[PDB]
Structures are given as C-alpha cells and as structure tokens.
Design an enzyme around this catalytic site. Structure first.
Site, PDB file in Angstrom:
ATOM      1  CD  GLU B 357     -11.072 -29.302   2.755  1.00  0.00           C
ATOM      2  OE1 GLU B 357     -10.402 -28.205   2.717  1.00  0.00           O
ATOM      3  OE2 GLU B 357     -12.183 -29.630   2.497  1.00  0.00           O
ATOM      4  CG  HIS B 487     -25.607 -24.204  -1.763  1.00  0.00           C
ATOM      5  ND1 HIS B 487     -25.962 -25.387  -0.985  1.00  0.00           N
ATOM      6  CD2 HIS B 487     -24.329 -24.046  -1.972  1.00  0.00           C
ATOM      7  CE1 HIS B 487     -24.744 -26.071  -0.883  1.00  0.00           C
ATOM      8  NE2 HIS B 487     -23.750 -25.276  -1.589  1.00  0.00           N
TER       9      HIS B 487
END
Ligand SMILES: *[C@@H]1O[C@H](CO)[C@@H](O[C@@H]2O[C@H](CO)[C@@H](O[C@@H]3O[C@H](CO)[C@@H](O)[C@H](O)[C@@H]3O)[C@H](O)[C@H]2NC(C)=O)[C@H](O)[C@H]1NC(C)=O
Ligand SMILES: *[C@@H]1O[C@H](CO)[C@@H](O[C@@H]2O[C@H](CO)[C@@H](O[C@@H]3O[C@H](CO)[C@@H](O)[C@H](O)[C@@H]3O)[C@H](O)[C@H]2NC(C)=O)[C@H](O)[C@H]1NC(C)=O
Ligand SMILES: *[C@@H]1O[C@H](CO)[C@@H](O[C@@H]2O[C@H](CO)[C@@H](O)[C@H](O)[C@H]2NC(C)=O)[C@H](O)[C@H]1NC(C)=O
Ligand SMILES: *[C@@H]1O[C@H](CO)[C@@H](O[C@@H]2O[C@H](CO)[C@@H](O)[C@H](O)[C@H]2NC(C)=O)[C@H](O)[C@H]1NC(C)=O
Ligand SMILES: *[C@@H]1O[C@H](CO)[C@@H](O)[C@H](O)[C@H]1NC(C)=O
Ligand SMILES: [Zn+2]
Lengths: 195, 596
Positions: B357, B487
């Site tokens: 991150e 997805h």
C-alpha cells in the site's frame, strides 16, 4: 513615540484575496524592523535589494504593505522575475524589486473544515499584470470566438476561482498569508525611519 | 483562437473545479470507510452523486472540442477522458435497467446464503463460512457440497440478470463506437497517436495469447505436481491424467492454489519464513511497521511520507467503539492529502501489505504534478504491479536480515528456496490460466461467439482445455458459474491481474539488473539502490501522460509485455518440477470427469 501600525497589517483578523491584494500606506511613524519573529518562526523572509536587520536605520518617504493569501506552492511566485498564475494575473513584482517578502502559514486561521471558499484568485486574464498592478473585474473571460455577452457558458468562464482551503490539505495547498514591503524614495523629506 | 487553446483553458477550469469536488467526495468516502455510521453513508452518497453529476456536465462540455483538431498529445488524453460518454448514450429506461441489474447482481453476490447443511436454520454466506470450507476442509464431499451449493444457489439467480447485463453493456459499447463490451474493456490498453508506441485493442488479445503460450509449460509441470500431491490427498477421487476437480483447488473458484501449500509443500520439514514471532518479540507496532516501510522507500531515493499522511490516517484498529472497513486501501484525496486505511496487526502478512500500500502511495505522490485526469497509472495493471514489487523486495530473507527480524545465521539452502518458489507459484502462476480463461470467456460472450444455450458448456470446455480444471458435477444452462465470482457479477475487468503479473516481474528484473543484484531473481532486494529508485521514479512520475508502452520501456527497455521475467523468476522451481515429474504425466486429457 508614534510608531508604525504593523499590528494592523500583520495581525489583521481577515486578509484579502490575492486578486484583490490590500495595500496600506505607511508614513509619519517609526518602523521597528528588528522584530525577527512576530507570530511563528520565520517562515518566508526574503529581502531583495536590502538587508533584513542591521538596516532599519534607512529612511524612506513611504512604506507600502501589500497583504494577501495564496497557497504554499505559489509563495515562490512572490519574487522578482517569477511566472505563474499569481505572478501573471494576480500579483506582479518588478525585476528591480527593492523591498521584502514576508509569508507565513495560516492553516489554523484560514482553513474551515467545510472548505474556506472566501479566498479567490484570478485564473484567466487577457494580459499579464504590470508590476504592482491590481485588477478586480468580475467580467466573463472570452476563451472562444463567440461573444460572451456577460454570461458564463460555452467557452465563457468566470475569471475567479475559490481556493476552498481545508485543514487537512497538504502543505502545498494550505492557506499562506503574504505581506510585501516596498520602500519609496521621493523628493519629499523622509517620513518613515528607525533609529 | 484555435480549438486547442480553447480546450486548454477549458481543462484548466476543469482541473481546479474537479480537484475540489473530488476532494470533497474523497473526504466523505473516507469518513464512511473509517467510521461506518448512517450520517456518514448519507454524506458519502451525497458527495458521490454531486461528483458524478459534475462529471457528466463536464463530459457534455468536452464533447464540443473536435479531438481530431488537437495536435497536443496531453490535451488529447484529457479530452478523451472527459469524452467517455459511457452509458449516457443509452435511453433513460435502458440505463435504469442496467443500473438495476448491476446493483441486483452485486446484492445477490454480497448477500447470498446457502442453508440446510443438516437443518434449514444453519445458513452460511460466502465469507467466512463457505470460504473457510473451501480453504481448510480435506473432505471431498464437504468441499463439493460447498462448491455446488454456492453455484446452484446464487449463480442460478444471477444467470438471467447476467444475460440482460451482457445485452445492455453491448448496446452501450456499440453506441460508443466499439465492437462489443470486451472491446470497450480492452480499450483501456489502447494507444493511438504516438509513432512507435501505438497499441490497438485487439493487439491485447494477440499478446496475451502469445505470452500464455510461453507460460504453458511451467504451468503444466506445476499442474502435474499438484495433481500427484492431491492424488495422495484424494486417492480414489483423482485421475492421474485428468483435469483437477474444481472444488479441491483451495478457494471457491481455483483463482489461487495458495491453500494447497499444506498439501503440496516440497519439503515440509524445513521451517517457513514467517517472521511474525520475531516482530512480536521485538515489540513492534503499526508505527514501527510503517516507519520501516518508509525507511525502505527512502533507502532507494524516494521521499518520506508527508506529515499530513502521518497525522491523517488510520493505521490501527480503532477498537470496538468505532467500527471501520479494514480492507487495506491507499487513499489519494488530492490537494496533497495522502492516507492509508488499514487495520494493521503485528504480522508478516500485514508488514508486506503495508509495503504494497505504501508503494501505491509513493506512486500517487510521484505523479501528483500531472493534471487531474492524468493522475493515474499508465494502464489498469501498473498500480498493483508497483505495490507487488514492493512486497517482493520486502519479503526476501536478505531484507528481513538487514532490518533485523530474521536471524543472521539463517542458511538459505536450495530446499527452503524450492519451498518459497513453490508457494509463490501456487498463487502467481496458478492464477494465470484462470484469469486468461475467464477474461477470454467474457470477451467471446460479449463478441457473440458463444450462444446462450451453451454458455456453461463452453465455460467448462474452456476450463478443461485451458486451465486443466474439470467440474465435479455437470451443470446445464440454469447455472451461471462465472458470475459466482465477485469480478464477474460486479462488472470489473479481470485481465488486469494477468497484465500486472507480467509487468511486476518485468519491473523486478529491470530494477534488480539496475541494482547490480547477484544470483537468482527471487533473492533480490533493491534496498539501497538509488539507480533502481531513479529508474522506477522515471516511470512513476509519468502517470498517464505517456503511453503505457513508453512507461514500461522507461523501466524495462521494452515496448511490450514480456513473459521471460516471470520465467526467469521461476526457473529454479521449473527445473525442479521437470525433474520431479520424470515418471509422472505432464499435461491433461480434457475428457475425464468425476461423474462418468
Ligand atoms: C501541450 O500543452 C501544454 C499545456 O497544457 C504545454 O505544457 C506547458 O509548457 C510550458 C512550456 O514549457 C510550461 O511553461 C513552463 O513553466 C515552468 C514552470 O515550472 C517554467 O520553468 C518554464 O520555463 C516554462 O515557462 C507550462 O507550465 C506547461 N503547462 C503545464 C500545465 O505543465 C506543452 O508544452 C504542450 N506540448 C507541446 C509539445 O508544445
Ligand atoms: C543498506 O541497508 C542496510 C539495511 O537495510 C543498512 O544497514 C543497517 O543499518 C542499521 C542501522 O545502522 C543496522 O541496525 C543496527 O545494527 C547493529 C549492528 O548490527 C545492531 O547492533 C543494532 O541493534 C541495529 O540492528 C542494521 O544492522 C544494518 N544492516 C545491514 C545489513 O547493514 C545500510 O546502512 C544501508 N546502506 C546504505 C549505504 O544506505
Ligand atoms: C464518527 O462519526 C460521527 C458522525 O455520526 C462523528 O460525530 C458524532 O456524531 C454527531 C455528529 O455531529 C456528534 O453530535 C457526536 O457528538 C459525535 N460523536 C459521537 C460519539 O456520537 C464522530 O466524531 C466520528 N468519530 C470520529 C472519531 O471522528
Ligand atoms: C524524511 O523523514 C525522515 C524522518 O521520518 C528523515 O530522517 C530522520 O530525521 C533526520 C533528518 O532530518 C535524521 O537526522 C534522522 O536520523 C532520521 N531518522 C531516522 C530514524 O533515520 C529524512 O531525512 C527525511 N527525508 C529527507 C530527504 O530529508
Ligand atoms: C539441494 O542440494 C544438492 C547439493 O548437491 C542438490 O544437488 C540438490 O538439487 C538438492 N538436494 C536434494 C536432496 O534435493
Ligand atoms: Zn494495493
């Protein structure tokens, strides 16, 4: 002893927007320049053509204190020979600037949690500002070839934009108070001195 | 005045208005994700609706500049971003139906429950119940029940919604001058205007297939090895020449074979490089983890994190009084505001994900000087690739030793290395055929090459042919197993993961060659390499200003995607598998099934 009212210019409750920078004429008073720090540590202190201290002894016919507020990234544009939005369309200093620039942070002062859109700046203009020129025109800028007729629309934009300062913004996008000091030399006897 | 100058002035006005509106929307969504209340959800939805309305207004405005008359590449890119037109080209009722079915599919996915394992009062959702089963159960019948229940319950509901979704999305894409919705999605990779760096929307299919062709042998050997090990685990259930049953792969779909490591570990006698106990014994906290990540990034010539970042962020669990969303996210709010949202625990996984991150955040800081619509990765795979190379560099034992969390006398034999490469491959190479086949199936469905009456037929044919995976029970056209994945049922493209997997090893190879690294690629730690830092920053600072081909060339020296970095990363494991399968079958027949 009748001193100069730097407390009015520097500790003012509200600073003007940069497109409408506020000028104060200082004369007939003793100017105390040996105050290095009056609010916070020296943030931005750049005297061009003159020394900061050990030089309050100079006398001038008038002093000009020009105050406004910009974002930190633009504090570099308050200098001789700079270019950018502020330097071109908002506030211009001459190349032979013999004065001083004093800027400092005001994130605790001019950052409203819901955004402080009371500070404006000029984004569009048909010509760069002459040094020390001020322009306050709420007239629609004509980017296109059709006439705007004083109405904002297709290729017709309002020239002013709000800074919308917020307390969490980065240091480059935080409210910064700026004060420019100019020193005038005229045929008249000097009216501002510090002994 | 010229059209280009008019567009430039329009973009200046747009940038400053959108910077501020996007900042308000970002602040609102942050206040939601870090402090889930009803007031916060209402503020988030208000700000988001304001931002979407502003975007549609600016789109209708930007459509007035004839792109063809623009000779400046940057203004052309920003104008194109505004010129999406996306779905707006649909009638009102058709757009409403599309939004309805999108939200309905999202709802049925995030809310589907299956009941009556033994009693109709016991019901489990996908997370954590069904996922716990698919991850830890060693019972063939239990795994099969979970797999088939999830599909025959939620996917049957999803099927007709997905057919109408396909038809409406194809209407949208065709009205926007595309061939189909698959062409629309592939448009993300399109480059049009730069001589020597162009890239069509079909060139993606060509490149993806040529590179999956080169990936095929390593995956075949991994498949054979995993098949044998699973035969040891499921003896009377698995054929030595057939595809792997889909419900024994480690998760709900087989997207990652990570949870098969306990069943496939080459040398289970060696200790695993989990430095969690060392972190706990050195009294590390989230502060120390993120400070160490910052030190890593500074060691290669990148800046520290901003004081705004350190003050405005949630880096620890806020506790029981204040509930938040704990999915690790890197927030770029604009106006110099950078944050990380993470409920960090003192574990090695959270250490690595913090590195990932913070790599995201460094990317965001580096392209901050770009105009608004150009502050984004070169394409959809670049951001995750950068985060992943950060985590790769951080996971190496060399780095772990230099930070002081691994003992200096830990010897790296060839068996801990083979263990590490196998565990890496189960996730990284196990997912490539899965990703490619799913996205190929969607492309073909959108293109109208797979009729509805054999959707699932071709789906499982492709499963068999491409992935080497076979369904444990037969499924007719009532099912909709592809939509049983997040997805697919939530309208997110999937080839991004394939492209990012190839990009990340390209980047790692390039930066380790720049860092004068010695030995096998997987032992590379780019720490203290200002050369690698500079080579990566030269691409990071570009954002979406240059074509993704140019951005990739800036770091790796190649204008196109490449598979050899990945193969060089996995070469030792490749040779080990080739030896291990000498008396085993490599490949699979597409015809064997567990149900005659
Ligand atoms: C395409 O149009 C863009 C404008 O959107 C052009 O970018 C602009 O280029 C000028 C000239 O380099 C930049 O002015 C420069 O400002 C810097 C201040 O850092 C100064 O040091 C330089 O001496 C120069 O005056 C301007 O900032 C820049 N605009 C933006 C938004 O970055 C671009 O050059 C055009 N492309 C071509 C090929 O002409
Ligand atoms: C290249 O990176 C390494 C580490 O990534 C840097 O060396 C590390 O420096 C730290 C702080 O000086 C050392 O921590 C301390 O080490 C001493 C002696 O081992 C120990 O007694 C302390 O308790 C503490 O752990 C660390 O050991 C050291 N690691 C290595 C492998 O050298 C190094 O300075 C970097 N080089 C450059 C040029 O930046
Ligand atoms: C979490 O969100 C709430 C908003 O629901 C924040 O404010 C609280 O709720 C109202 C909102 O004006 C206030 O009157 C309360 O006094 C606030 N506190 C509580 C306990 O209800 C709240 O501040 C947010 N939490 C944090 C840590 O910022
Ligand atoms: C970025 O921030 C770090 C601190 O978070 C800076 O390094 C520390 O502070 C001074 C630097 O002024 C050093 O003397 C300390 O030794 C540093 N601390 C540690 C633990 O290393 C760092 O210098 C900053 N980056 C740059 C380029 O100045
Ligand atoms: C690891 O080391 C030996 C050293 O000769 C190597 O030949 C072989 O590949 C490995 N050994 C075993 C027992 O797997
Ligand atoms: Zn990430």
């Amino acid at each position: 002893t009748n001193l100069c009212p730097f407390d009015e210019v520097f500790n003012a409750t509200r600073f003007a927007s940069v497109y409408a920078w506020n000028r104060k004429r200082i004369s007939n008073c003793v100017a105390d320049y040996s105050v290095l720090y009056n609010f916070a540590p020296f943030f931005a202190f750049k005297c061009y053509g003159v020394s900061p201290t050990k030089l309050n002894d100079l006398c001038f016919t008038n002093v000009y204190a020009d105050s406004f507020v910009i974002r930190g990234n633009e504090v570099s544009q308050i200098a001789p020979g700079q270019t950018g939005n502020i330097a071109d369309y908002n506030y211009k200093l001459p190349d032979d600037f013999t004065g001083c620039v004093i800027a400092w942070n005001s994130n605790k002062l001019d950052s409203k949690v819901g955004g402080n859109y009371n500070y404006r700046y000029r984004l569009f203009r048909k010509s760069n500002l002459k040094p020390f020129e001020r322009d306050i025109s709420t007239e629609i800028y004509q980017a296109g070839n059709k006439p705007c007729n004083g109405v904002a629309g297709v290729n017709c934009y309002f020239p002013l934009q709000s800074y919308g300062f917020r307390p969490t913004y980065g240091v480059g996008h935080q409210p910064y108070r700026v004060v420019v000091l100019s020193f005038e030399l005229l045929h008249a006897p000097a009216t501002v001195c510090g002994p | 005045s010229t059209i280009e100058e008019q567009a430039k002035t329009f973009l200046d006005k747009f940038n400053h208005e959108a910077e501020d509106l996007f900042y308000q929307s970002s602040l609102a969504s942050w206040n939601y994700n870090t402090n889930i209340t009803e007031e916060n959800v209402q503020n988030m939805n208000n700000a988001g609706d304001k931002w979407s309305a502003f975007l549609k207004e600016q789109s209708t405005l930007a459509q007035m500049y004839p792109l063809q008359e623009i000779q400046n590449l940057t203004v052309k890119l920003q104008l194109q971003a505004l010129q999406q037109n996306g779905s707006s080209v649909l009638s009102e009722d058709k757009s409403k139906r599309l939004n309805t079915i999108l939200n309905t599919m999202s709802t049925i996915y995030s809310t589907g429950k299956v009941c009556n394992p033994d009693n109709p009062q016991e019901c489990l959702l996908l997370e954590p119940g069904l996922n716990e089963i698919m991850a830890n159960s060693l019972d063939y019948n239990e795994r099969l029940w979970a797999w088939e229940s999830w599909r025959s319950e939620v996917g049957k509901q999803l099927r007709p919604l997905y057919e109408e979704y396909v038809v409406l999305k194809n209407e949208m894409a065709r009205a926007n001058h595309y061939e189909d919705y698959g062409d629309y999605w592939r448009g993300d990779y399109e480059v049009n205007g730069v001589d020597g760096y162009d890239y069509s929307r079909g060139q993606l299919i060509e490149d993806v297939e040529h590179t999956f062709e080169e990936i095929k042998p390593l995956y075949e050997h991994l498949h054979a090895y995993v098949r044998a090990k699973l035969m040891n685990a499921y003896p009377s259930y698995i054929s030595p020449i057939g595809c792997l049953p889909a419900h024994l792969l480690g998760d709900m779909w087989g997207r990652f074979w990570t949870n098969l490591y306990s069943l496939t570990v080459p040398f289970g006698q060696k200790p695993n490089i989990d430095v969690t106990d060392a972190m706990v014994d050195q009294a590390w906290d989230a502060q120390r983890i993120f400070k160490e990540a910052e030190k890593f990034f500074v060691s290669v010539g990148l800046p520290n994190m901003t004081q705004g970042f350190w003050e405005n962020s949630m880096l620890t669990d806020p506790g029981n009084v204040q509930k938040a969303v704990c999915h690790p996210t890197a927030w770029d709010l604009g106006k110099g505001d950078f944050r990380i949202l993470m409920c960090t625990k003192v574990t090695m996984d959270d250490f690595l994900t913090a590195h990932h991150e913070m790599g995201h955040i460094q990317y965001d800081m580096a392209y901050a000087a770009q105009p608004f619509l150009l502050r984004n990765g070169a394409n959809e795979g670049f951001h995750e690739a950068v985060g992943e190379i950060m985590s790769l560099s951080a996971a190496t034992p060399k780095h772990l030793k230099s930070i002081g969390l691994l003992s200096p006398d830990f010897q790296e034999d060839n068996e801990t290395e083979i263990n590490f490469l196998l565990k890496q491959a189960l996730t990284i190479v196990g997912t490539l055929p899965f990703t490619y086949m799913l996205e190929k199936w969607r492309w073909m469905v959108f293109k109208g090459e797979i009729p509805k009456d054999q959707w699932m037929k071709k789906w499982w044919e492709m499963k068999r042919e491409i992935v080497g995976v076979v369904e444990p029970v037969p499924h007719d056209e009532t099912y909709c197993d592809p939509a049983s994945l997040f997805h697919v049922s939530n309208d997110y493209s999937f080839i991004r993961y394939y492209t990012r997997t190839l990009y990340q090893f390209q980047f790692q190879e390039a930066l380790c060659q720049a860092a004068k690294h010695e030995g096998p690629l997987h032992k590379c730690d780019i720490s203290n390499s200002t050369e690698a830092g500079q080579k990566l920053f030269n691409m990071l600072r570009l954002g979406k200003s240059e074509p993704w081909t140019l951005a990739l060339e800036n770091v790796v020296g190649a204008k196109n995607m490449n598979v050899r970095p990945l193969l060089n990363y996995f070469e030792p494991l490749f040779t080990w598998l080739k030896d291990q399968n000498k008396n085993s079958f490599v490949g699979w027949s597409t015809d064997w099934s567990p149900y005659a």
